[PDB]
């Protein structure tokens, strides 16, 4: 990763601990695919099954976004943040 997206990508996922915890799951799962892709690369596991005890939701969205670079996760990940920051302070305003 080149050294000004890291430092963004530090800065916005600890900003993203800033976000209502009553955010929808639809996009807690979006951060989530991205932040794995982002920091460990591409999902590594089978698809858990429909009864695993593993979350199904949380492995689709990982698996979702294989392929990208850490450059380009972290890149999405950061412009996903902004927004869903952008939108919290709406929310409040
Ligand atoms: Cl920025
Ligand atoms: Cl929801
Ligand atoms: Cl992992």
């Known amino acids: ?3 000004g997206l890291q430092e963004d990508f530090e800065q916005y996922a600890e900003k993203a ?12 799962l979006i951060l989530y695919g991205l932040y ?15 009864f695993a005890q593993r979350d ?3 492995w689709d969205a990982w ?20 927004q869903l920051l952008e939108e919290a302070a709406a929310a409040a305003s």
Not at 37 to 48: E, I, K, L, Y
């Open 1 to 3: 990763g080149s050294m």
């Open 17 to 28: 601990k800033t976000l209502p915890e009553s955010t929808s799951n639809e996009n807690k």
């Open 36 to 50: 794995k892709q982002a920091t460990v690369g591409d999902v590594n596991t089978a698809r858990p099954g429909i």
């Open 56 to 58: 199904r939701a949380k």
């Open 63 to 82: 698996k979702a976004v294989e392929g990208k670079s850490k450059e380009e996760a972290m890149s999405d990940y950061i412009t996903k943040v902004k």
